[PDB]
Amino acid sequence: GLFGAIAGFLENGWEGMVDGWYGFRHQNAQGTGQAADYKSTQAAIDQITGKLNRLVEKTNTEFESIESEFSEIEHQIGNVINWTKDSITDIWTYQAELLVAMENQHTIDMADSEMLNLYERVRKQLRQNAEEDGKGCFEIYHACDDSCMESIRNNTYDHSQYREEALLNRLNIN
Amino acid sequence: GLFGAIAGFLENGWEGMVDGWYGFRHQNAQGTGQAADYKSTQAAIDQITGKLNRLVEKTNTEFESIESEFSEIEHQIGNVINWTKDSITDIWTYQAELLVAMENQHTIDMADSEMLNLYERVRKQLRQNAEEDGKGCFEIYHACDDSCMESIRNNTYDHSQYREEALLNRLNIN
Amino acid sequence: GLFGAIAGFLENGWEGMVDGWYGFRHQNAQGTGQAADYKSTQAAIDQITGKLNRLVEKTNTEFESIESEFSEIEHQIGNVINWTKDSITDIWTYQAELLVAMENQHTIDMADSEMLNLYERVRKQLRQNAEEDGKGCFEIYHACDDSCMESIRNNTYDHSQYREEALLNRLNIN
Amino acid sequence: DKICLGHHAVANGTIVKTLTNEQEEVTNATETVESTGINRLCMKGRKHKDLGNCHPIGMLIGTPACDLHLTGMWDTLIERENAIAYCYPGATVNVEALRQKIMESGGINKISTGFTYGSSINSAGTTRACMRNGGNSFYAELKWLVSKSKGQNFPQTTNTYRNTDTAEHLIMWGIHHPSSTQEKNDLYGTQSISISVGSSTYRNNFVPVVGARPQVNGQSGRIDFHWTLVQPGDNITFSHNGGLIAPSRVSKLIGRGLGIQSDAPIDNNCESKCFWRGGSINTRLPFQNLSPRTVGQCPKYVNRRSLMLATGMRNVPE
């Protein structure tokens, strides 16, 4: 999409994650884990809710009838009324169609944006200890057990604690 | 613009590239070469095609005439018709003006976004074997013949194959 | 935000910067400093000025009165006029509300964009001589005097001049 | 060791439209066009009046079907189909302006003209078409003026209504159009008949016309109705010599109200603000496709079955 992540460098979504919109999967010596990221999910969710609030807000404007249901309308005035109403209907169906199309475009694009923002904040967290694999994964160059994986997700990972070991494994030398 | 690439960190476009919208220029011992990227070009074009189709989808509302061309209209109702039609016309020219300006903004941004997604794709293929110009070029820290350049454009280039030679060249050590 | 910088990985704005919209704060041995960036700031301002000019452009359409202020209008044609004008007013306040809403979203997002574009520019300037701190800062791995800090802001900083020292500093070897 | 970033997907996706894609699939969407109405007139919270088979105009002149409705107060007024305005066959000039005027009011007061007539004038005309309690009658607010001497000239008479109120009043009168020269002579005389109505702002003239016409409710005669507004402090004068159906009562429209034309049942237990011929509409949604003809505070009519608003990201399953 606009931001290259969703339907981009990530091959697909995870149906198994019903915990949230965005999250983590990991692999280490101790196995695998899955976890949703709450901050990124709520960010996207809040914007959706705002769209639905602005959609629903009522702006009326009470109308009376100008077309009798049960008796005759004079012909000329009735054609002028029909012409006007169809013209107004044509404007409203146009606006509703454009509104929905533009909003939908924006929704799927910001959702892609929130995904990217998460991936970006993780990249900067690990700085010199990991490398990108191209598919939305960070290959970590040190042992990262379940509590290390948790600290990455909770944004409490301290890169200085693993730097020496990691730089060692990345350069292969020293 | 929005994404920093087109009319951004890329100095200018390439008139020579009649092959596609986005592409590669390379430089090695065999010399220089140029090739277009298909996937990224089609992503942009398909999106433009989509806008044109929505633009061209036609509403089905048939209108009768409410103004005689060839005979008089009673003055008061004629003034109403005039006022109405002129108002509906003002609404439509506004909408047409807004539609076009807004679509144009989005078309220019998404095109810049496809450029950036291709640049980022390449950046991730090379990982530790290359460094960024700041001008849309990757300096490759190993020898890359015409086949190697092809593997990059065609997304098959294995970074692990050239990593050792590359890391030696970047750290400036034998 | 869409680009994740303003109200994103940037903790907050700087109230002390009245010289521009975007800027640098540095810290070295000589002390601290602050400077605004003209280029990125003008990119944002010019785009806003362009929105304001489009808001100000005016239609030539003259309208005559179709409701007497000082005499009675026949009831049926009065109700039609009332219906039409109210219908048209609704379209316009809807349009205006939509106009503003759509515009403000785009303005907020492009300002975020210019902030990111500047950041990216700096990141590629320093290339291998500095590391991202995760909060908008670059930790420089060599001594950087005010003359050097100025070179970065001025886009004249030569990375090759400090590369060898910076690499030794980053790999913690001497 | 590796950590992977990702997003949710679902097996059963929803299809929406975008600026570029007509068939874009997303995780979730919601409808923006209301397609479902309520088959009832939701009158909760509103002091309403159901006219039944009483037509709004019948309220003014006093058609028997409108005896329960000759005055009142309401914030909404419901007109039904095939309602009755005329017991004796006739028509009203500018009927639709008058009906709309009544259908946007919040009540009706009735005030007497205090018209009195000579003994030569029989002011209790009656007809089989206006049955009121098994006995021939007439419009409650009008008086069919007839010569008490069958065949003799209706006397030149003059009646004046004086509006002593601070608001405008609605006055209606009728003109009788006899079906035969015989009938015409019997009721009013052989003289040239003329009615002239005049106020400070209104002046007009009417002449009973004899003509052959089919029978409606048995009658081949007709009664045409006319009306105007009498301003505060103003008097309106009736100068006539036969064929004037004179007003014993005058109307007064109070405030504002909502007028609805529906044959849908009344439900005093649900609330609504939007109505149409088929009932009520209760939505948060901005658009509807039930009817282009609505009254009240309504969603905008659109010509679409469905307009889905995405409420989730792209769906990319596997």
Place this chain on the structure above:
Amino acid sequence: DKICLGHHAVANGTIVKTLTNEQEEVTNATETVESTGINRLCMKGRKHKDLGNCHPIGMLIGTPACDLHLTGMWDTLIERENAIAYCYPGATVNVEALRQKIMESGGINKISTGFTYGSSINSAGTTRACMRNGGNSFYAELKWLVSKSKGQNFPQTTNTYRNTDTAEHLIMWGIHHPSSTQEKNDLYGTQSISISVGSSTYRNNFVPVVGARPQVNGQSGRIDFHWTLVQPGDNITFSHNGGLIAPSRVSKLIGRGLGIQSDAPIDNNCESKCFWRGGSINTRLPFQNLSPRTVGQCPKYVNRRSLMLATGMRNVPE
């Protein structure tokens, strides 16, 4: 060794408008407002009727210019400028509402009234204003009734049209207004004259009025036309004693059609759904700047010469 990423550019870039810039150079662009019409009425695929110099109202009364358009079926009706509706000088009450009914119909059926007149009446009144086959004629669907014996009182007559159809019928009649008293007395006698038309839903009265006026088509007498709709099952009665131009046939408007007022020549080879006074508009574009007066299914009119839709990226040349 290095690899560089890039995007194309062109030497002939166009300018478009965006939200922020009025002069943005892009690689390609396309127009969204149609400026070009076809100066012909594209009638392919449509069963159409070019009325030529016959005016739609003429189809109902039967003016000689409309002899070939008295009956028919069509899905598009074409009216021309200076079309003739009145051979004998006159006017129609509510002609525009009536003209519009004709222009949105899919055909006309004619049915006889079955009107018969006695010997004292000459029903074959004729005029040189309505020439037909080199001889004085009259409107083909009407009849100029006149005293057969010159100078005598027109007899008191009564005619009734019964609509026994399942649909409503359009009935037209005329009232003759003589230029002088001598002319009147000649045609209808000296008696006071009155024409009374009455149905179940319609009643109106008419009195031919003598007056001096300029000559039109050689005549200073006039024929005012009137009309109404007779509902199915209903009967309409004409009560008259001279001055009535009576209907011999009645009109039934059939189905629905597109009314086009234009002076553009027909082309049965091109096809369209949008028409204006100057011809047809054939476009996939959503807007047009030809005319704010169009009929059919059209692009919306806008007050703009050109609105370019960018179909390519920003152009950054060299």
Place this chain on the structure above:
Amino acid sequence: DKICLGHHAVANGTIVKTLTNEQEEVTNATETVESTGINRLCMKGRKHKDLGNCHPIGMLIGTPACDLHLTGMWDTLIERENAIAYCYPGATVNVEALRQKIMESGGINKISTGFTYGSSINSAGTTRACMRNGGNSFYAELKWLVSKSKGQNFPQTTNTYRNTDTAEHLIMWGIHHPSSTQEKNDLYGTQSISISVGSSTYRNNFVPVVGARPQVNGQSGRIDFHWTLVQPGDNITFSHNGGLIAPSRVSKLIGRGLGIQSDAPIDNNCESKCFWRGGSINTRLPFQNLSPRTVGQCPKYVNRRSLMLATGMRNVPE
């Protein structure tokens, strides 16, 4: 050693709306809806005519209040509240159509009809309702015709106006409706009274009708005014025997002008293109919330006090 990137912030942020947020805080913003008007009529750069207490109809018939407004040129006409059209009480048929014709004109020329009357006609009928120079007068463009001798039958008379110009002319006449059979006899005789008007495109008949009615400006009589347009080269003929209020002058409406209805004072030092009852509106802004009833080139009216457009980034203060 580190270098940091950042954006500005302000202490006092402004609140705007977005697609997702109704309370978004930015650094700066600007109004899009004009709420401030100018309570004066900005007439700089335009030839205007302020009619004061003269009603636009009165310009045609020549009421004393309009004596300074019988002819002229302008590009904007200003009508005021409670302007006078009638000195002798009455009403104009289709007056709103007529008033709008004048209000969009840019000047009036007056041309004489040339009407002459026989010796049995007093063509200088006069009334205390139209005072001019301390003496009884009449409408300046009309002539109250009365039998020279009280009680004597008004002569059958004929008057024809020729339009020999290249433009259409506006002709008005009146019909006198007397308050008593007594008054009618004195003025026009005992005979039956009829007024017949016919051109090539217009014909109509009028009958003066006696009726009792309240006094307006001392008079219980009425004059009802009528009008038509006479096409160039066409004649219009008046056939009458009492009751005609004949024209001595017809009007020609010239060019185009802007009609304004306001009680705001004129200011010749400011320019404006937008007007309403309250004065002028001058903005760069596209929307306004002053009034839904404007004239000229105006910003579109909206139902909002305020709609702020962001002109700075998100405000993230600290």
